[PDB]
Design a protein around this ligand. Sequence first.
Ligand SMILES: COC[C@]1(OC)CC[C@H]2[C@@H]3CCC4=CC(=O)CCC4=C3[C@@H](c3ccc(/C=N/O)cc3)C[C@@]21C
Lengths: 11, 243
Amino acid sequence: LEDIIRKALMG
Amino acid sequence: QLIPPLINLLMSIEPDVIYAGHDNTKPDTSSSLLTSLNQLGERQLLSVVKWSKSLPGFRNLHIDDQITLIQYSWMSLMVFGLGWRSYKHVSGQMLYFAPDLILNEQRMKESSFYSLCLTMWQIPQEFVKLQVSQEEFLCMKVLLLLNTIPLEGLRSQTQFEEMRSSYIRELIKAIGLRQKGVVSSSQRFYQLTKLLDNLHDLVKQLHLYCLNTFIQSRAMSEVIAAQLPKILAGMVKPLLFHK
Ligand SMILES: COC[C@]1(OC)CC[C@H]2[C@@H]3CCC4=CC(=O)CCC4=C3[C@@H](c3ccc(/C=N/O)cc3)C[C@@]21C
């Protein structure tokens, strides 16, 4: 999920 | 002049109701419940990441710490919210995942993961017993996000410790709203933090169940290598309030 919780933070 | 400003901001940044998009007009099946939990699960995660972006102090932490903290605690955050909704909407008598995904005792027993339902059911029952307030809950939930860090710590370690210290002070204000006495409010603080300390154990139970559920879906060594640090002791560092 590290990629999901990462694209979400930077939006 | 009744509720503290920060506790009120937490309530206002509280994400809206999230639906699982489950169809309750069809007989349940092991897969349709698992399919719905995963759909709802992913939505709630985007919800957590977003909620965090409005949390005083969070964005000021290094981006790598924000990711780490979300990774380390999304399971506990979600199971904590589950408990809260179960506790207030149905008196902790059933698991209130979403308005369209509620599982009572019967539906639990006949859901593919009954033993996992009892484990998660523990949190709502505690809430009932302790009669947890909304102000207390909100402060407790922030602490869950700040309850686990890497063994080596965080890049913004000092900034992080100061954020956690504030929400700890905020939890005490929340307790002070009803528990006026020095000994009483002191005793409740212990009860609420002891509870949070207990989630470290329950949480790995959930990650383990998550992994096994995955193993059974397809019937691999690399997938199990990245999950063990979430179900096993000695890889991350839990911040306990009590020795
Ligand atoms: C049958 O269970 C399968 C699980 O694991 C197979 C193991 C534990 C579940 C989570 C328990 C906490 C929770 C609270 C909610 O508010 C609804 C969803 C939820 C869970 C589910 C879940 C699915 C996906 C995600 C995130 N996706 O990006 C998060 C939570 C399913 C698991 C993890």
